Amino acid sequence: HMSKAFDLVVIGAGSGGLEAGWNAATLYGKRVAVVDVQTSHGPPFYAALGGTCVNVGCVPKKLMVTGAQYMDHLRESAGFGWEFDGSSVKANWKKLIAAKNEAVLDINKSYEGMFNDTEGLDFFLGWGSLESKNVVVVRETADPKSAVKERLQADHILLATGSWPQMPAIPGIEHCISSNEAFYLPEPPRRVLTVGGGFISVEFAGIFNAYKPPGGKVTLCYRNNLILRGFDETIREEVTKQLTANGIEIMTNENPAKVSLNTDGSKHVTFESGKTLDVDVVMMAIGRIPRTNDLQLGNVGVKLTPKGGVQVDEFSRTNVPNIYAIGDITDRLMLTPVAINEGAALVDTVFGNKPRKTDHTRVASAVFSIPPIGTCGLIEEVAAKEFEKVAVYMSSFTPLMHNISGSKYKKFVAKIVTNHSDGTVLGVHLLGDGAPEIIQAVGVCLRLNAKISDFYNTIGVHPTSAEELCSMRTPSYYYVKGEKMEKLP
Amino acid sequence: SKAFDLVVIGAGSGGLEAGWNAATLYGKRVAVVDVQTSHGPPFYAALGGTCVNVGCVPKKLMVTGAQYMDHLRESAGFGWEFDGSSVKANWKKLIAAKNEAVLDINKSYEGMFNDTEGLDFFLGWGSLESKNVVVVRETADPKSAVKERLQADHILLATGSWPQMPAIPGIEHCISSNEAFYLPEPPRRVLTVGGGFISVEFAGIFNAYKPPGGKVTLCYRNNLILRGFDETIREEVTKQLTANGIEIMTNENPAKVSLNTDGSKHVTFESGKTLDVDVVMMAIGRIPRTNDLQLGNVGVKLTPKGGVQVDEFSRTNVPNIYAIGDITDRLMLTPVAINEGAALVDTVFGNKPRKTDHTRVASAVFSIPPIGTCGLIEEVAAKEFEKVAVYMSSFTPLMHNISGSKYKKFVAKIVTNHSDGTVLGVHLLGDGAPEIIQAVGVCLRLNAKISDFYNTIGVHPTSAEELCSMRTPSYYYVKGEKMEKL
Ligand SMILES: Cc1cc2nc3c(=O)[nH]c(=O)nc-3n(C[C@H](O)[C@H](O)[C@H](O)COP(=O)(O)OP(=O)(O)OC[C@H]3O[C@@H](n4cnc5c(N)ncnc54)[C@H](O)[C@@H]3O)c2cc1C
Numbered sequence: 001h002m003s004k005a006f007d008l009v010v011i012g013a014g015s016g017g018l019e020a021g022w023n024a025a026t027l028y029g030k031r032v033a034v035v036d037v038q039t040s041h042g043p044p045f046y047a048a049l050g051g052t053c054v055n056v057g058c059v060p061k062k063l064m065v066t067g068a069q070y071m072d073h074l075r076e077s078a079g080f081g082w083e084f085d086g087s088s089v090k091a092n093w094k095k096l097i098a099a100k101n102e103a104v105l106d107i108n109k110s111y112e113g114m115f116n117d118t119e120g121l122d123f124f125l126g127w128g129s130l131e132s133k134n135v136v137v138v139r140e141t142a143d144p145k146s147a148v149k150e151r152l153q154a155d156h157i158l159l160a161t162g163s164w165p166q167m168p169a170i171p172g173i174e175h176c177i178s179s180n181e182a183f184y185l186p187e188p189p190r191r192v193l194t195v196g197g198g199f200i201s202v203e204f205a206g207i208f209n210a211y212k213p214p215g216g217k218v219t220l221c222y223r224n225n226l227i228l229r230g231f232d233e234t235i236r237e238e239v240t241k242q243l244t245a246n247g248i249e250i251m252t253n254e255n256p257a258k259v260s261l262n263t264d265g266s267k268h269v270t271f272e273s274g275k276t277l278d279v280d281v282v283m284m285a286i287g288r289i290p291r292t293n294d295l296q297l298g299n300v301g302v303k304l305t306p307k308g309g310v311q312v313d314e315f316s317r318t319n320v321p322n323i324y325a326i327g328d329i330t331d332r333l334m335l336t337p338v339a340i341n342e343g344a345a346l347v348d349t350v351f352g353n354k355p356r357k358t359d360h361t362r363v364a365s366a367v368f369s370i371p372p373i374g375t376c377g378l379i380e381e382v383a384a385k386e387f388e389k390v391a392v393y394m395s396s397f398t399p400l401m402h403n404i405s406g407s408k409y410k411k412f413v414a415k416i417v418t419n420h421s422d423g424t425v426l427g428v429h430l431l432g433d434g435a436p437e438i439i440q441a442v443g444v445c446l447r448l449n450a451k452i453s454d455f456y457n458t459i460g461v462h463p464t465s466a467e468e469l470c471s472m473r474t475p476s477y478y479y480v481k482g483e484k485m486e487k488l489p
Numbered sequence: 490s491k492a493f494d495l496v497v498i499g500a501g502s503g504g505l506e507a508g509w510n511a512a513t514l515y516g517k518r519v520a521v522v523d524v525q526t527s528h529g530p531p532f533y534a535a536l537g538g539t540c541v542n543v544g545c546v547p548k549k550l551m552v553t554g555a556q557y558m559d560h561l562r563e564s565a566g567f568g569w570e571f572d573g574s575s576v577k578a579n580w581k582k583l584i585a586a587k588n589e590a591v592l593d594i595n596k597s598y599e600g601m602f603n604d605t606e607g608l609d610f611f612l613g614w615g616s617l618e619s620k621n622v623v624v625v626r627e628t629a630d631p632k633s634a635v636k637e638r639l640q641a642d643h644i645l646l647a648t649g650s651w652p653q654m655p656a657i658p659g660i661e662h663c664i665s666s667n668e669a670f671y672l673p674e675p676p677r678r679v680l681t682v683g684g685g686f687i688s689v690e691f692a693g694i695f696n697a698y699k700p701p702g703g704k705v706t707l708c709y710r711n712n713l714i715l716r717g718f719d720e721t722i723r724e725e726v727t728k729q730l731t732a733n734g735i736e737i738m739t740n741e742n743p744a745k746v747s748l749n750t751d752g753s754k755h756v757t758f759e760s761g762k763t764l765d766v767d768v769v770m771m772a773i774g775r776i777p778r779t780n781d782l783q784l785g786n787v788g789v790k791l792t793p794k795g796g797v798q799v800d801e802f803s804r805t806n807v808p809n810i811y812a813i814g815d816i817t818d819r820l821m822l823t824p825v826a827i828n829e830g831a832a833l834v835d836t837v838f839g840n841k842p843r844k845t846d847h848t849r850v851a852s853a854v855f856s857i858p859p860i861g862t863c864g865l866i867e868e869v870a871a872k873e874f875e876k877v878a879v880y881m882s883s884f885t886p887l888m889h890n891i892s893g894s895k896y897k898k899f900v901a902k903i904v905t906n907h908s909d910g911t912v913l914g915v916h917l918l919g920d921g922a923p924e925i926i927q928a929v930g931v932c933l934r935l936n937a938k939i940s941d942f943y944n945t946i947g948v949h950p951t952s953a954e955e956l957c958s959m960r961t962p963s964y965y966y967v968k969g970e971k972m973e974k975l
């Protein structure tokens with residue numbers, strides 16, 4: 001049996017690696033090999049063909065947030081005249097998970113079909129690692145002593161193995177799970193603690209809160225004062241109030257010290273503060289780390305950053321000439337469309353002789369919390385460090401449908417941050433139903449260097465939440481040499 | 490007799506922007522006249538305008554209400570269980586809630602007048618007595634009792650529009666959108682007449698709230714509803730309305746209506762077909778509301794269509810008389826009317842001449858599912874440019890394979906000047922389309938090109954990200970003819 005030769009070998013058939021592989025083969029005629037550990041979603045390895053987003057990430061989680069939103073629709077319909085037996089209402093978690101599994105498996109099979117079909121785009125099942133500068137080895141397991149399935153010769157090698165949930169070293173960590181297992185729980189937990197203040201912990205808290213059985217309770221804990229570091233502070237505070245208003249307990253300044261099993265098998269969580277909490281599930285969502293350890297990068301000398309990701313330049317090159325890295329393995333912005341963009345830019349540069357580098361600024365993104373967040377660009381405290389004078393335009397209003405729905409607590413917030421010197425928009429931050437869909441074209445605006453007056457000159461679509469972005473023209477306050485103030489001196 | 494810098498006839502969308510801006514931004518003395526202080530019969534429009542009282546605001550609420558019919562059914566695919574036969578749609582509760590929400594806005598507009606210097610409200614019917622005098626009478630009758638005589642350095646006409654009713658025997662047995670907002674009972678069988686957004690939106694409303702055994706029909710005299718919108722989208726929304734139980738009668742037009750012994754209506758079409766319904770709602774158009782203004786006293790000119798004639802700065806033929814909003818018979822939208830008012834006040838009372846841009850205006854249809862659009866449809870662009878590209882995406886989103894509403898295709902279309910890639914128009918159909926389109930209106934003011942959309946990183950997973958993944962045209966127009974290749 002002979003080794004096989006390729007122009008590009010890709011390790012990891014995920015968001016970035018599939019984009020790079022498809023494009024190299026179909027746009028430029030190269031011969032491409034792509035490696036992944038599993039052909040379809042779920043245990044044992046969770047991620048598989050298609051990547052983390054497709055299998056245990058954006059796609060399943062957005063289906064489950066959608067299912068969770070119906071708790072709000074069913075209740076809110078009554079303000080509009082809808083009547084039904086409220087006592088008969090049941091959230092069937094098994095049906096949600098079965099429907100999600102089926103949709104995900106369909107994408108798995110479609111990816112498998114593409115490979116079986118496409119000229120010069122080949123898939124290989126196993127664990128890829130770097131043997132030498134121009135040879136990828138595929139093994140049966142992650143252990144480098146497991147059996148060799150293939151050796152793939154490669155002029156160019158792309159590292160795109162993604163990331164993995166981080167678990168803290170606490171007594172009883174064996175009793176906790178991560179988001180990977182959360183996607184496959186047989187029954188919805190009566191009491192669940194989600195640990196962490198980031199988007200995964202928040203999104204999952206909203207899912208569990210809608211499907212909990214009668215008498216259930218969702219608790220989110222975070223070790224610092226305010227959840228969702230990195231997002232707009234006004235939105236960080238309002239999303240907390242609205243999560244609380246939907247029945248979620250948010251324990252800030254609290255962090256688990258240990259977990260033990262009660263005699264009945266529930267989990268007994270003890271915090272550093274000495275507080276205790278009994279729950280049926282502890283889901284850790286405290287961060288995600290790049291998957292480097294299994295690539296045997298020492299064999300060829302690929303440098304990692306102090307933080308732990310593969311070091312790359314603006315064109316995704318490592319310190320080894322023909323070896324590249326994109327996506328979550330670079331431990332920077334962990335979003336699917338960034339990985340896809342890096343994959344497309346790398347292939348255009350290397351094989352298309354039209355060079356191009358990914359713009360990591362002004363990336364639009366969303367949090368699918370209930371209610372959701374949309375954001376593009378800088379938060380005000382960051383902009384205030386870089387610009388002499390920053391203006392902040394802010395509109396916070398209850399939409400009219402929530403005058404009737406009951407959920408008067410569902411304020412919509414729109415904020416625009418500018419360079420007050422010339423009116424250039426530095427960032428837009430939104431909270432409320434529709435915010436993820438609204439922000440997308442805001443991203444095109446910022447790539448076109450929109451000023452606040454381009455937003456204000458635009459005639460609104462009425463009645464919408466989004467029209468409030470186009471009717472703001474006096475700042476609510478300023479930052480002058482970093483000092484917040486209602487008025488300019 | 491009382492003196493004023495500006496007299497505004499009509500306390501509506503454009504008339505209230507212009508009034509308040511004149512008073513608080515330039516310290517002028519302002520009087521605003523309207524026939525009614527809150528919504529509903531007898532005059533329907535009132536303080537706040539058509540949009541507030543019998544337009545965008547109540548219809549958005551009621552459309553929101555009609556969407557729960559789909560939410561209740563779709564929730565099953567995501568595991569939601571409940572007693573489906575226990576479900577009923579209480580129309581009176583909807584109307585009652587809508588009435589209170591509208592009244593709250595009526596009252597807030599009242600306090601605004603009581604709290605603002607140089608801004609007074611007058612109840613009654615305003616008309617032009619002489620070139621600098623506005624009269625307020627008790628009724629629309631030009632002989633009713635004079636309540637006030639306001640003299641104005643400047644007069645602003647902003648009385649909006651009113652439903653058009655065709656001259657067919659039995660028209661008096663038909664209603665318009667005005668009365669639909671106040672029907673005591675949701676109609677069991679109803680015919681909505683017209684292809685425009687009002688017919689289409691109310692059809693979706695009645696369809697959700699109809700009692701058991703009910704049926705909504707929409708008829709339209711030509712072949713395809715929603716003239717003026719994208720043609721792919723007119724065809725799709727027809728299909729998706731039909732999938733949800735609404736009968737679309739194209740190429741049919743009522744010829745007479747008559748009263749049945751049980752109180753229902755018998756409709757005869759020009760084709761000879763007949764239909765018995767409980768309600769016939771005419772939605773065939775809205776016409777400028779000029780008749781009660783006594784424009785003949787001062788000689789304000791009307792275009793042949795009936796709009797007050799204006800220049801780019803809202804000036805009539807009579808100096809110091811202006812007209813904005815639906816009475817100029819142009820784009821009949823609330824944000825256009827507001828923009829027109831503010832530009833007028835900036836020009837007249839500030840040192841800031843300003844005209845409204847009537848191009849690239851984003852707007853929406855709150856049909857189920859809804860439409861969002863900005864700029865040119867492909868066949869209009871094909872008459873203005875030699876080379877036009879059309880980029881298109883249309884599929885059922887994943888969630889609606891699970892929900893079971895698999896007919897719910899999302900459609901996104903981008904129209905470019907292929908010569909330089911400049912985006913001329915964007916057209917959307919599907920949940921969220923009215924919200925997605927807003928910032929697209931901003932992109933078109935920066936002369937975005939298709940490559941600016943495609944080079945922007947997408948938000949995943951959303952419907953909106955489809956707009957940033959279209960690289961290759963689906964087809965083209967060259968010298969006005971449609972073809973798939975260049
Ligand atoms: C719960 C959750 C929700 C998320 N939601 C969103 C969201 O809403 N929007 C968004 O933009 N992003 C979201 N993300 C992030 C998104 O999933 C990632 O940013 C994206 O998948 C990273 O793409 P990538 O190409 O770097 O790697 P991945 O998509 O992770 O693909 C890497 C692949 O490599 C394989 N692999 C690993 N090691 C090896 C090896 N040695 N040999 C062979 N194959 C290997 C893995 O099995 C995997 O398939 C979410 C993530 C999580 C965990």
Ligand SMILES: Cc1cc2nc3c(=O)[nH]c(=O)nc-3n(C[C@H](O)[C@H](O)[C@H](O)COP(=O)(O)OP(=O)(O)OC[C@H]3O[C@@H](n4cnc5c(N)ncnc54)[C@H](O)[C@@H]3O)c2cc1C
Pocket residue numbers: 462463498499500501502503504522523524525532534535536537538539540541543544545546548613614615616647648649650666687778781782813814815816821822823824826
């Ligand atoms: C059913 C319906 C739904 C709509 N939905 C939308 C939507 O979603 N989005 C959108 O942008 N547009 C919508 N519109 C259009 C919008 O309502 C109008 O474009 C807007 O109200 C026009 O504003 P205007 O300033 O011209 O006058 P209006 O807002 O109509 O105000 C005119 C006012 O003048 C008063 N008046 C009339 N005659 C006299 C007189 N002789 N003396 C004194 N006062 C008088 C009236 O009572 C009224 O209050 C809708 C319209 C309708 C009918």
Ligand SMILES: C[C@H]1C[C@@H]2CNC[C@@H]2N1C(=O)C(C)(C)C
Pocket residue numbers: 397398399400463464465467468546594
């Ligand atoms: C509640 C506010 C703000 C919402 C966002 N834009 C539409 C909604 N509103 C209004 O249109 C009124 C007329 C009530 C001001």
Ligand SMILES: [Br-]
Pocket residue numbers: 091092093094095187188
């Ligand atoms: Br269940």
Ligand SMILES: [Br-]
Pocket residue numbers: 452453456473
């Ligand atoms: Br401005």
Ligand SMILES: [Br-]
Pocket residue numbers: 682683684708709710711742773
């Ligand atoms: Br018609």
Ligand SMILES: [Br-]
Pocket residue numbers: 711712713714716
């Ligand atoms: Br037609």
Ligand code: NA
Pocket residue numbers: 399400401463464465
């Ligand atoms: Na609204």
